[PDB]
Design a protein around this ligand. Structure first.
Ligand SMILES: [Fe+3]
Ligand SMILES: [Fe+3]
Lengths: 325, 166, 327, 167
C-alpha cells in the first residue's frame, strides 16, 4: 500500500499547483480538474470535483466506495484506501482499462487536503449549496482555508450530554440556515431530580439540524453500540455516488429527496426513490446512490459501523438487503 | 416565506420506489407515520434493521407500561407531545437480563427505584434512555415516536405489511 | 400512424414563479435548482444550468443532425420535419428493461413549446449560450427574463461570409467585438484587389477574426458552402452542452488551442475513446458514437458537415460505412 | 495575458486518440501541418473526406501551376502569406469538363482569359475560388493551406501514412 505523493509545480498562468499521488496526477485550470494515471486521463468540472473532494476529505474516505463520478473515486479500507479510474465502470472493466492504486490513508488524505486547499479560491465554499456560495472558476484567487478545515462533530453518546458534542446556538456560531427559518427552536423540558442531571438529557434535534452550516454531511448525533444516527441537512445534489460496503438506511425528516440508484459494480440505473417526511428506506449493499434536494431538507442517515460487515457481504454470510419478505 | 415540511400521524404523504430494473422490495420502503398510525399504542414496530440494530416506530397514546434495557436507547419524538418519566432501578438485574438486548416490557406495576426526572418531547426532540433506568411514557393526544435500539422482546417485525411491494 | 402536435402550457407555480409545460406524454417543470421531467412510467432530474444550456442548443440548431442527448437519459432525434423526444432510448439499462419511452412530434409543434420552456425558465442576467465565466446564474425563483439572449438570429452563409447579399463579416460597429479570450488574435482583412467588373467574385475575409468575434459558444455556423459540404466553424468554451449522436460522419478541424472529446457508443452510452485535438488536428466522429467536447480556453473549431439528406438512410441500411475513410 | 495558440508548419503539437474500447483508425486522425510539411509543393493531400467532399491540405511554395474547377472551392490560409491570382477563363469548357468535379491542374502556361484579381491571404484568411475562374498561387516562403473541394484529379489519398494507426 503506497505512500509516495508529491507537490509538483505552480502553473505560471493558472496560479494552481499540481499534485501526484502514486501514478495519478491532478491538475486544475480555470474550469476543470484534469486527472491522469498510467494508461489514460479524465476531466471533471472543477465545481463538482471540489464538492466531491470536500466530502471525501471531511468524511475520512467515508464507508465503501466514494465515486466522484462514473470514472474516478476512492474505496475505504479503514487504514488504507484504494484510488481508482474506471474500477466501477463496465466499459473500462470489460476492456481491462481500469486502473487502481492502493495507499496508506494518511498519505492520500494529506495530498487530498493540499489539493482542496490549493484549488479552492476566495469566497467559494465547496461544503455549501450553490445558492449559498460563490464560484470556483478562473485563475487562483486567494483561498478558503476556513471553509475546507471545519472540525468534524461526532457525539460519543448523544448531543448535549456533559463532555459530549454541544447543542448549536447563535452564540457558539451556528445560526439557523435561511431555508429552515421557520423551524421551531425551543428545547424540550428536562427536569432532573437532584443528583441525576448528567443522566436526564434531551435536545431539539430538528433545531440542531436547522443550524448545520454544511450540506450533505452525516454527523453522529446518538450512539448505541455500532448503530449511529447520522443526520444532516441536504441541498442541491449529493456531490458523490455512494456505493456502501454494508447496508444503510435513510429516514427523511423534512421536505423531500429523490435518490438516483444505480448498480454499484457497473453504474447502470436501477431505481429512483422519492422520500418525503417520514419515509424510511434501505440502500442495499450492491447499489450506489446519489440524492437530489430542492429545498434544504433534514435527513437521518442510519449506519452500522461494525468493521465485520464488508467481508461478510463479500463472503455471503451477510445479505445485500437486510430484510426480505 | 420558507415552509419546512414535516409529517404527522394525521398528515403524511408517502413517496416510493420508481423502478428501472430492480425489485422494489429491495429498498424496504415504509412511512413511519403510517406505521405508527396502524399499530397498537406503544407497540414498537421495526421500520429499519441492520443486523441486530433496529429503528422502531410507535404511537404514544395514553400511558405506557414500564420498559428497561441492558444498553442505552434513544427516542425521537416525530409528532405530538410526549412525556417521559425516568426511574433509577434499585435492582435492574431483577427486571432486565444482563445478557439481553432490545427493550423489555417490565410491567405496569411501578418498579422499585428513585425518581430520575421527567422529559417533555415535542416533534424533533430526542431524549436519552440510559441503561439502568426504567422509563414510561404518557401522551395526551396520539403522537408518533421512533426508537434507536436493538431487536429484542418488544420488537415487532411485519415487513410484508408495511413495505412497498409495488 | 401520425406524428403528434399535442402540447400545452400548464400552470404557473406560485412559489417558484415558473410555468410548467406538457408535450405529448412529457411534462416539464423547473424549481430553484432542477428541471423535473416526467413521462408515462418515469421521471428524471437535470440540474437547471445543464438543462438550459442543452435546450438553448436544440432550439438554436432546430434539432440539429441525428441525436441531441441532453444527458445519459433524455434527448431528441431529428427526423427533419418530425422529431422524436425520448427518455432512455440510448441508455442500455432502460432499453434492456423495456423502460425507454419515445414520442414522435411534428417539428414545429415540439419547437414552439421548447421555445416557451427556454423563455419562461431563463432568468434576467443568465445567458445559456455563453460560457460560465461570461454570465450570471439560473438558480432560484423566476426573476425577469433573458429573451434577447435566447432569441439570437441564426447566421448562415449561402455561399461565403462577406459576398454581396450574403451573411456579413463581424465588426465592432455591427455589434460583434472580439471576445476577451481571443484578445490577441490579429484582426486585419486580407488584401483583395478586383479588376473592374469582377468585384462580386474576388472575395476573401479573416475567418479566424470572424470566429474571435462569435457572441455565443458551441454553435456551428455555416461560413462557406460547396454543394452539401458545409464549413461550420464556432468558438468553444467550457463543455459542449449535449452529447451528439450524429446520423452521419462529421469532421472536426481544431483551429486554435485544444479540445478534448469524450467519445461514447451512440446506442449504449459506453465510453469508447477520448480524443485530444490541438491546433491543426483534424479527425472524424464516426456515425456510431456520440461525442462531448471540453475546451478550457475559448477555442476556434471548424465543424465540417455533409448536409446531404440521403446519408442517414444509407448508414441505417448498411449501404454507407459508419467510418467515412478506410485504411 | 491571453495567448491564442495557432499551429504553423514549423511549430505544431499533434494530439490524438486514447482508446478505451475502439480502434484509433475509426477517427482518421492527422495534423494538417504535419501533412503539408511532408508533401511536395502544391500537392493536395486529402485530410478529410465525406463521400465525394474533401478537405485537402497543401504546402504552398513558389508559384503553382493554374487550376480550374467545375464548381466553387474555398481556400483557407493556415500559416504564412499566400497570394492568389484569379483569371476569368474565355472558355472554361476548354480546360475543365463542366461535368467533372474536384480541381483540375490546367498547366503552367497562362490560360486564355481576363485578369480577374489578386488576393493576398495570411493565417486565418479564407478566399472564394469561383467556378469559371482559373487560379494560381504564389508563396515566397512555405505556407500551409487548406481546400474545401470535391475528390478529383489533383486529390492525393494517403490515409495509411497520415493518420494515427496505433494507440
Ligand atoms: Fe450512502
Ligand atoms: Fe457532432
Amino acid at each position: 500500500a503506497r505512500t509516495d505523493t508529491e507537490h509538483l509545480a505552480i502553473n505560471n498562468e493558472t496560479g494552481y499547483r499540481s499534485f501526484r499521488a502514486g501514478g495519478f496526477t491532478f491538475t486544475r485550470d480555470e474550469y476543470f480538474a484534469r486527472l491522469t494515471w498510467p494508461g489514460g486521463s479524465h476531466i471533471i468540472p472543477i465545481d463538482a470535483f471540489l464538492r466531491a473532494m470536500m466530502r471525501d476529505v471531511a468524511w475520512g474516505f467515508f464507508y465503501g466506495v466514494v465515486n466522484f463520478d462514473h470514472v474516478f473515486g476512492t474505496i475505504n479500507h479503514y487504514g488504507e484506501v484504494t484510488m481508482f479510474a474506471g474500477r466501477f465502470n463496465d466499459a473500462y472493466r470489460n476492456a481491462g482499462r481500469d486502473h487502481e492504486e492502493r495507499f496508506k490513508s494518511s498519505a492520500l488524505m494529506a495530498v487530498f487536503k493540499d489539493i482542496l486547499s490549493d484549488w479552492t479560491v476566495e469566497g467559494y465554499d465547496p461544503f455549501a449549496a450553490p445558492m449559498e456560495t460563490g464560484l470556483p472558476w478562473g485563475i487562483k484567487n486567494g483561498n478558503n482555508d476556513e471553509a475546507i478545515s471545519r472540525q468534524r462533530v461526532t457525539a460519543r453518546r448523544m448531543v448535549g450530554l456533559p463532555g459530549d458534542t454541544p447543542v448549536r446556538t447563535d452564540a457558539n456560531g451556528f445560526p439557523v440556515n435561511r431555508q429552515f427559518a421557520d423551524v421551531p427552536q425551543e428545547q424540550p423540558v428536562v427536569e432532573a431530580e437532584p443528583g441525576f442531571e448528567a443522566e436526564v438529557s434531551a435536545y431539539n434535534l430538528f433545531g440542531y439540524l436547522s443550524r448545520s452550516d454544511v450540506t450533505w454531511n452525516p454527523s453522529v448525533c446518538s450512539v448505541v453500540g455500532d448503530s449511529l444516527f447520522c443526520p444532516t441537512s441536504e441541498e442541491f445534489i449529493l456531490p458523490v455516488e455512494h456505493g456502501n460496503d454494508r447496508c444503510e438506511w435513510f429516514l427523511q425528516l423534512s421536505d423531500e429527496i429523490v435518490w438516483d440508484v444505480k448498480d454499484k459494480e457497473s453504474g447502470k440505473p436501477r431505481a429512483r426513490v422519492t422520500a418525503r417526511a417520514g419515509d424510511i428506506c434501505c440502500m442495499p449493499a450492491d447499489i450506489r446512490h446519489q440524492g437530489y434536494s430542492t429545498k434544504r431538507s433534514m435527513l437521518l442517515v442510519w449506519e452500522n459501523g461494525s468493521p465485520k460487515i464488508p467481508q461478510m457481504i463479500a463472503d455471503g454470510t451477510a445479505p445485500v438487503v437486510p430484510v426480505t419478505f | 416565506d420558507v415552509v419546512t415540511e414535516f409529517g404527522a400521524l394525521t398528515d403524511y404523504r408517502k413517496g416510493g420506489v420508481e423502478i428501472i430494473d430492480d425489485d422494489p422490495r429491495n429498498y424496504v420502503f415504509s412511512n413511519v407515520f403510517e406505521v405508527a398510525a396502524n399499530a397498537a399504542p406503544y407497540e414498537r414496530v421495526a421500520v429499519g434493521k441492520n443486523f441486530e440494530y433496529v429503528i422502531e416506530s410507535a404511537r404514544a397514546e395514553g400511558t405506557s407500561g414500564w420498559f428497561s434495557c441492558a444498553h442505552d436507547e434513544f427516542v425521537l419524538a416525530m409528532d405530538g407531545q410526549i412525556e417521559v418519566h425516568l426511574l433509577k432501578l434499585d435492582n435492574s438485574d431483577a427486571y432486565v437480563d444482563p445478557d439481553s438486548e432490545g427493550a423489555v416490557a417490565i410491567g405496569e406495576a411501578l418498579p422499585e427505584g428513585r425518581k430520575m426526572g421527567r422529559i417533555v418531547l415535542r416533534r424533533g426532540h430526542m431524549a436519552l434512555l440510559p441503561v439502568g433506568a426504567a422509563y414510561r411514557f404518557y401522551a395526551e393526544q396520539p403522537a408518533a415516536m421512533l426508537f434507536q435500539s436493538i431487536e429484542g422482546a418488544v420488537t415487532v417485525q411485519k415487513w410484508g405489511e408495511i413495505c412497498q411491494t409495488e
